[PDB]
Nucleic acid binder design. Structure first.
Ligand code: ATP
Ligand code: ATP
Ligand code: MN
Ligand code: MN
Ligand code: MN
Ligand code: MN
Ligand code: ZN
Ligand code: ZN
Lengths: 356, 337
DNA sequence: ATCTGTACATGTACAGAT
DNA sequence: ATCTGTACATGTACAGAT
DNA sequence: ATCTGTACATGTACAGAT
DNA sequence: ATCTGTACATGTACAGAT
């Protein structure tokens, strides 16, 4: 009852969805078209909608959309970047529209993301129907973000991705541990899907950065979010309804509200809570451990789990086990302790940040 | 005990599987070579008990579709039968006559089988009522192969199936929609009549049969759904072996009955291996109810009654009920031979 | 005359709305 | 409960290119 | 267009642990 | 008797090379 009314707050409205989806699809269509025209290096690029809005876990308002422009790159080998698991150099044996981005065998991420961005910037200029601009480039972002004033503000991340259809890299062998939850045939099929590489695009000044790519599994996460039960009928019209997505929404909201207020929490992002809950879904595979009548227990055990990840400084990538999103090298212990105390406070005081 | 012991008997042996399959693959590989003639573009889809892992006793009967992609055919229902259709609009020299198409198809097989000199393999006399060209093979052991000619249509499933495949509370709506996006097939049966085939859909179900995704997987629990199919298949095989009065029954009847039971009883825990006996017994009970009411509807085509008087005589159904009721109430003597 | 990328046409799970 | 807009998977048509 | 290569599902088999 | 783990065998989906 307490949290059922928070979810009612977080529920998107069909009117806002229509209006936001109407505009967003128009801009994305045009951008996809221009990509195909002339002698564009990105001809052949294909579209994949990913992220919260397409998983039906986008909360509060349909105001941020993530879409991937994926380019199939054949004949490709990969140099893992310093045993980090998630970052790679892309190389080419053979000797190609991507020639202008080559740097002798190795493919440049920033060169390719700059040209990409240039094309988007230009194509946005020729849009007089709607109020749309390109956000200033952010470090670490593989995206070209559109800022739309549809009266209301709307972000769109155009994510540039390489597509490889070969078997996933060995750093993911022990990843995606869904055998006791979605099972082994689901895991095999998912791992027959392509894998994706997005530009790391850091500006830390370290070697290789600028030619460093990062693995992406947004497509697999989209599948998992919309096929999340041990029973095939979970949340279907002739099935029982679980509270897995509702729990993700509340956790997302906790982090969003806190992040709006305290900039100490800049290190953190919603992908953290997304990863923590994929683990909880593996830990607690049965649909009967996400009964909507136990919403509070379920939300509380997800918080308990997240608290332990913050304290023990460990939150493994769901797809790349050896990569720790809560490593010291990524977030201070101070930043983690600060969030740990803020979560315990909300936890033991009636969640007053939900009423803001 | 009894039933575990019987299941041990019916279990195929790795060695016999290895021997039969390599010989069977040789003939199908060679036959499918030849076909791509008017059947160029024919693709091989393996079907039936052996490929569903419910073949019992011996690997001695294999089923194969040679399906043919055929575009924008008009379909027309046969006097409201449900499952039989006339087909209208390379294959020009055949309304598409199933009889005609089958015969040339047959002619090719026959011709090519005559060229095989490394395997003892002949073509069985044509059986009226069979859409199959059947091969009889001798390794030192007898093995028969059904080469099934199918048309493949990539459009919506016909209207008579709209209420079919009632898997919604079992395998669910997403599975049902994806299955119905697969193509549907048409198979020869009056001379130009074809029949719908869903062997491809039945193969997926047999191998994705649980309400939980992990059913019968390495990180899941075993159910006894396939063992019940095997036991019921065995009971009918042994009865037909002995009673010519049961000539009109076939294993597909048993298969159809258990699909209904799997829909009636969707939860994996209703098919617990610790409950093999009751599960078997309630399958027997359901099958007798089908006999008693003369009603066993095609799982994909609900109006089509496989147990109508028109196809199986009232006498034959009561004869099979008497014999099953007997074996049921006597501890299955027939399982002992 | 044919071929074929692009995009209309069809159907339905999901979840908001009445 | 039923009605219903969006997203998305797959089947097909046809303008414009061959 | 056709075929090999790869991965892992579905089986059977058999011994050592329960 | 049943269960676990390893070995052994076939089927099948699809990347990619020719
Ligand atoms: N740090 C990251 N590492 C790996 N994948 C990430 C990371 N950040 C985002 N992604 C992927 O990109 C998608 C879009 O990210 P985004 O930050 O918009 O979050 P979201 O999941 O869409 O939710 P919301 O935008 O409502 O916070 C994520 O769903 C995830 O699949
Ligand atoms: N009357 C029928 N109607 C529809 N499909 C049928 C019919 N008879 C057989 N089939 C299809 O052809 C397949 C092969 O049939 P067949 O007679 O070989 O039985 P089976 O299921 O393979 O089992 P087994 O040979 O072990 O008894 C079946 O599995 C089914 O898909
Ligand atoms: Mn998002
Ligand atoms: Mn984003
Ligand atoms: Mn068979
Ligand atoms: Mn057969
Ligand atoms: Zn659910
Ligand atoms: Zn099972």
């Amino acid at each position: 009852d307490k949290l059922k009314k928070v979810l009612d707050k977080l529920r998107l409205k069909r009117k806002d969805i229509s209006e936001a989806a109407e505009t967003v699809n128009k801009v994305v269509e045009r951008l996809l078209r221009r990509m195909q025209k002339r002698e564009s290096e990105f001809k052949g690029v294909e579209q994949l909608n990913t992220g919260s809005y397409y998983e039906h876990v986008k909360i509060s308002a349909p105001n941020e959309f993530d879409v991937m422009f994926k380019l199939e790159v054949p004949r490709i080998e990969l140099q893992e970047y310093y045993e980090t698991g998630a970052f790679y150099l892309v190389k080419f044996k053979r000797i190609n529209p991507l020639s202008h981005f080559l740097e002798g065998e190795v493919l440049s991420a920033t060169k390719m993301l700059s040209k990409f961005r240039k094309i988007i910037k230009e194509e946005v200029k020729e849009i007089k129907d709607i109020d749309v601009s390109v956000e200033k480039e952010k470090p670490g972002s593989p995206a070209v973000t559109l800022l739309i004033r549809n009266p209301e503000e709307i972000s769109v991340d155009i994510i540039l991705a390489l597509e490889s259809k070969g078997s996933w890299p060995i750093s993911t062998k022990e990843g995606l541990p869904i055998q006791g939850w979605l099972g082994t045939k689901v895991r095999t099929n998912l791992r027959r899907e392509p894998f994706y590489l997005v530009p790391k695009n850091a500006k830390d000044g370290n070697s290789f950065q600028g030619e460093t790519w990062r693995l992406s599994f947004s497509h697999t996460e989209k599948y998992i979010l919309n096929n999340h039960g041990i029973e095939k009928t979970c949340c279907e019209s002739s099935g029982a309804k679980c509270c897995r997505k509702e729990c993700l929404k509340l956790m997302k909201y906790l982090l969003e509200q806190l992040k709006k207020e305290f900039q100490e929490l800049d290190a953190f992002c919603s992908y953290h809570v997304k990863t923590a809950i994929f683990h909880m879904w593996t830990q607690d595979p049965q649909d009967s451990q996400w009964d909507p009548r136990n919403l509070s227990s379920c939300f509380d055990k997800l918080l308990a789990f997240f608290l332990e990840c913050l304290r023990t400084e460990k939150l493994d990538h769901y797809f790349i086990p050896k990569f720790n999103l809560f490593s010291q090298e990524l977030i201070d212990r101070k930043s983690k302790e600060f969030l740990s105390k803020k979560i315990e406070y909300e936890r033991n005081n009636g969640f007053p940040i939900f009423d803001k």
